[PDB]
């Protein structure tokens, strides 16, 4: 307790001595409270005018238009201690999983140089603004690195002064760039060296890309066994227990030297003990603490979420297969049974899953899995939108399974070759491309963000009639040599000035390990669409008067945007489509 967090709290007391008061009207039940102090400030969603002017029919569709307008009583909840049998299952499974993930990888520190390069190429590291303006400036100043040095030596000494979270079904915990560096140095290897790639982790999909996820689900579907289960957890980050954080920390058992001590300090001082500052309109700043829940950088959060989800789903599979009888207590001979199951079939059982952080798909050995709920509920991983003891409903068809906000279609090219393509309701795709975040967007920056969405649509969603047409219109409306841009950055093959047909051939044909025939496609007309009725099912406006007038008159829309941007060099991409080809 206060011997680990006191110094951080002490240091905050003194910067705001003209305001410190142990307020009595504090709304916290499950967070430990320490004091308040004075502040006064808050970034809404802004519309992308280039995308909106080229998607006119969607101006009257409320599912699109409402997306641009506008639970912290789940952060202030508590999870119960799991039983002794559950704690043993989790410790055995976690020990085994770190060894498997570690067989072909070597833990190592990430460098000032790798961090400095990350900040100089826009990664959403979740930092705060203020002794330097941006991240870019702090990194190019030896004063910053001396602050980092001070904290680093405090961490080696087993102590923390400045590693404090700032809070803001979401809750993002920003830290100062220095605390983020020390997290990246100790634990960045999990992401930088691809510990959760499918090759290394068997269940993971880190680095795979949206063009591979449907092929991966089809490969899981080919296994003998029961239905495909895709249960969502209610508020995963709030259900991470102190027992979960202690099993995650066992990665440090595979480290040595400085790295070992630096990583044990991140886990002990910042993950298993946290200090947070939160805005309350009653506008003041509260300083609260707690031992559990997930509060890390979003990239470390992703890898540890994937680890703990892999662990939880293997235990759920053991429960369905009858490996242990009760969570109350694991007997001596059940321990050996569990260890033996892991050694004998653990790798096969991992290959039956696709896991992306808190998101999973599992094809278990049979449907006993559906009603195997005691360990899952006792670990605190309570399913969303189902009663606690109601058996899971599974999917009989891999093309209907939800994963990473998508479903997947099997699409047959006129030449017989098979594409497995990503899809989601088209209102969600158009509504997201019409939105930007942040201030000071030039017209050029806005256009280049529109081009990023358009090239993503050409590569991932070419099979949706409306998106292939809107993508061609946006690419025709933005100067041809202008480079697609994003403020926040799966693999991003659409972020390029290369010809999109060349990129499509590389991704879907040349580098696609599920495509045996490597014959290149010569034109967009060779690339198929969903059936017309399936396109409509997934939100297409084909067959509406609004959509027909938009498609017929698209050159007028393209010319409106060109007139706003001005006299630049443009390409007409519309004749790549049969209907505009004369």
Ligand X SMILES: O=S(=O)(c1ccc(F)cc1)N1CCNCC1
Q: Which range of residues in 17-25, 103-111, 262-270, 441-449 is near ligand X by CB under 6 A? A: 441-449
State which residue, 201 or 455, has the beta carbon closest to ligand X. 455
Task: Name which of residues 397 to 436 contact Zn ion (CB under 5 A).
Answer: 423
Burial degree of 316 (CB within 10 A; 0-12, 13-18, 19+): buried
Of 581, 566, 555, 536, which is closest to residue 54 (Cα–Cα)? Answer: 555
x/- track of binding to ligand X for residues 394-433 (CB under 6 A): ----------------------------------------
Task: Name which of residues 520 to 559 contact Zn ion (CB under 5 A).
Answer: 538
Token pair of 394, please? 């599974």
The number of C-alpha atoms within 13 Å of 434 and in the hemisphere containing its C-beta is 23
538 binds, among Zn ion, ligand X, none (CB under 5 to 8 A by kind): Zn ion
Q: Give CA separation, 201 vs 103, 196, 263, 303, 497, in Å.
A: 10, 5, 21, 11, 34
122: left (phi over 0), alpha (psi -120 to 50) or beta: left
**How wide is the angle at C-alpha 502 spanned by C-alphas 496 and 505, nearest 5°?**
120
Q: Give CA separation, 159 vs 2, 94, 112, in Å.
A: 12, 27, 21
Annotated binding residue 466: no
State which residue, 134 or 563, has the beta carbon closest to ligand X. 134
- Binding of ligand X at residue 534 (CB under 6 A)? no
Q: Cα separation of 233 and 350, whole Å?
A: 19
Annotated binding residue 170: yes
Interface pick for ligand X out of 442, 488, 556, 567 (rule CB under 6 A): 442
The number of C-alpha atoms within 13 Å of 139 and in the hemisphere containing its C-beta is 18
Task: Name which of residues 126 to 155 contact Zn ion (CB under 5 A).
Answer: 151
Tell me which residue has its CB nearest to ligand X: 445
Interface pick for ligand X out of 120, 344, 393, 532 (rule CB under 6 A): 532
- Binding of ligand X at residue 106 (CB under 6 A)? no
Interface pick for ligand X out of 54, 245, 278, 448 (rule CB under 6 A): 448
Of 466, 470, 482, 473, which is closest to residue 558 (Cα–Cα)? Answer: 473
CA dihedral (181, 90, 99, 364) positive or negative? negative
Closest approach of Zn ion to the CB of residue 539, in Å = 8
Q: Which range of residues in 161-169, 375-383, 465-473, 507-515 is near Zn ion by CB under 5 A? A: 161-169
| Contact (CB, 8 A) for 534 and 409 | yes
State which residue, 305 or 446, has the beta carbon closest to ligand X. 446
Token pair of 274, please? 């946290």
| Contact (CB, 8 A) for 423 and 409 | yes
State which residue, 26 or 444, has the beta carbon closest to ligand X. 444
Annotated binding residue 359: yes
Closest approach of ligand X to the CB of residue 493, in Å = 19
Interface pick for Zn ion out of 97, 139, 148, 160 (rule CB under 5 A): 160
The DSSP bridge partners found for residue 407 are 423
State which residue, 6 or 479, has the beta carbon closest to ligand X. 479
x/- track of binding to ligand X for residues 308-327 (CB under 6 A): --------------------
The DSSP bridge partners found for residue 31 are none
Helix or strand (DSSP H, E) at 214: helix 210-221
Q: Which range of residues in 19-27, 145-153, 272-280, 440-448 is near ligand X by CB under 6 A? A: 440-448
Q: Are strands 407-412 and 359-362 parallel, antiparallel or unpaired?
A: unpaired
Interface pick for Zn ion out of 163, 228, 456, 500 (rule CB under 5 A): 163
448 binds, among Zn ion, ligand X, none (CB under 5 to 8 A by kind): ligand X
Task: Name which of residues 278 to 307 contact ligand X (CB under 6 A).
Answer: none
- Binding of ligand X at residue 533 (CB under 6 A)? yes
Q: Which residue has the tokens 């429960």?
A: 319
Annotated binding residue 206: no
Q: Cα separation of 482 and 484, whole Å?
A: 7
Closest approach of ligand X to the CB of residue 519, in Å = 30
Nearest 5°: phi and psi at 395? -105, 135
Interface pick for ligand X out of 298, 425, 536, 546 (rule CB under 6 A): 536
- Binding of ligand X at residue 445 (CB under 6 A)? yes
Annotated binding residue 233: yes
80 binds, among ligand X, Zn ion, none (CB under 5 to 8 A by kind): none
CA 287 from centre of chain: 28
If one counts every other C-beta atom within 10 angstroms of the C-beta of residue 432, the result is: 16
Closest approach of Zn ion to the CB of residue 138, in Å = 16
Interface pick for ligand X out of 543, 552, 563, 581 (rule CB under 6 A): 543
Q: Are strands 274-280 and 284-290 parallel, antiparallel or unpaired?
A: antiparallel
- Binding of ligand X at residue 485 (CB under 6 A)? yes
Instruction: Write out the DSSP string of 431-476.
Output: HHHTEEESS---HHHHHHHHHHHHHHHHHHSTTSHHHHHHHHHHHH
532 binds, among ligand X, Zn ion, none (CB under 5 to 8 A by kind): ligand X
3-state secondary structure of 556: helix
Closest approach of ligand X to the CB of residue 221, in Å = 27
Binding residues for ligand X (CB under 6 A): 442, 444-445, 448, 485, 532-533, 536, 542-543
Could you list the residues known to form a binding site for CTP, using ranges. 170, 235-237, 305, 384
Could you list the residues known to form a binding site, using ranges. 151, 155, 160, 163, 170, 232-233, 235-237, 305, 358-359, 384, 407, 409, 423, 538
């Amino acid at each position: 307790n206060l011997d680990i967090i006191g110094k951080r709290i002490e240091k905050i007391k003194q910067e705001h001595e003209t305001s410190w008061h142990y307020d009595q009207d504090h709304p916290y039940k499950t967070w430990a409270y320490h004091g308040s102090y004075e502040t006064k400030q808050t970034a809404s969603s802004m519309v992308n005018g280039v995308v909106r002017l080229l998607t006119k029919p969607w101006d009257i569709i409320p599912m699109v238009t409402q997306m641009a307008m506008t639970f912290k009583e789940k952060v202030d909840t508590r999870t119960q201690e799991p039983k002794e049998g559950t704690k043993k299952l989790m410790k055995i499974t976690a020990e085994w999983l770190w060894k498997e993930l570690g067989k072909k990888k070597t833990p190592r520190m990430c460098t000032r140089e790798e961090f400095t390069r990350k900040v100089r190429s826009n990664a959403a590291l979740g930092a705060i603004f203020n002794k330097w303006k941006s991240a870019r400036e702090a990194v190019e100043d030896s004063g910053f690195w001396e602050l980092v040095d001070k904290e680093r030596n405090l961490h080696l000494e087993g102590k923390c002064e400045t590693c404090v979270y700032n809070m803001m079904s979401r809750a993002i915990w920003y830290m100062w760039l220095g605390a983020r560096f020390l997290e990246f140095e100790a634990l960045g290897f999990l992401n930088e060296d691809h510990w959760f790639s499918r090759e290394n982790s068997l269940s993971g999909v880190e680095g795979e890309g949206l063009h591979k996820l449907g092929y991966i689900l089809r490969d899981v579907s080919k296994k003998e066994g029961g239905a495909m289960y895709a249960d969502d957890t209610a508020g995963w980050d709030t259900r991470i227990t102190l027992e979960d954080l202690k099993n995650e920390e066992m990665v440090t058992n595979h480290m040595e030297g400085e790295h070992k001590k630096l990583a044990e300090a991140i886990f002990k001082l910042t993950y298993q003990n946290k200090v947070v500052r939160v805005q309350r309109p009653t506008t003041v700043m509260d300083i609260i603490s707690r031992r559990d829940q997930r509060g890390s950088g979003q990239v470390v959060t992703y890898g540890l979420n994937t680890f703990t989800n892999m662990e939880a789903q293997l235990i759920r599979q053991m429960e369905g297969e009858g490996v242990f009888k009760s969570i109350q207590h694991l007997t001596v001979t059940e321990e050996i049974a569990v260890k033996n199951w892991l050694v004998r079939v653990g790798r096969e059982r991992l290959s039956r899953m696709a896991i992306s952080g808190d998101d999973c798909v599992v094809k278990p050995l049979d449907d006993r899995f559906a009603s195997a709920l005691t360990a899952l509920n006792d670990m605190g991983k309570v399913r969303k939108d189902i009663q606690q003891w109601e058996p899971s409903r599974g999917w009989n068809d891999w093309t209907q399974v939800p994963f990473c906000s998508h479903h997947f279609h099997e699409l047959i090219m006129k030449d017989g070759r098979v594409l497995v393509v990503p899809c989601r309701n088209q209102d969600e795709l158009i509504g997201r491309a019409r939105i930007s975040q942040g201030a000071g967007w030039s017209l050029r920056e806005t256009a280049c963000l529109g081009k990023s969405y358009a090239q993503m649509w050409s590569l991932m969603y070419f099979h949706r009639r409306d998106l292939r047409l809107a993508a061609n219109a946006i690419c025709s409306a933005v100067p041809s040599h202008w480079v697609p841009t994003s403020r926040t950055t799966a693999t991003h093959e659409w972020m390029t000035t290369e010809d999109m047909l060349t990129v499509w051939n590389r991704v879907w044909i040349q580098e696609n390990p599920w495509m045996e025939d490597k014959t290149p496609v010569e034109s967009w007309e060779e690339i198929p669409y969903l059936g017309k009725r399936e396109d409509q099912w997934c939100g297409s406006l084909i067959g509406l008067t609004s959509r027909a007038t938009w498609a017929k008159n698209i050159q007028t829309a393209i010319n409106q945007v060109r007139s706003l941007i001005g006299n630049e060099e443009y390409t007409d991409y519309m004749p790549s489509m049969k209907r505009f080809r004369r």
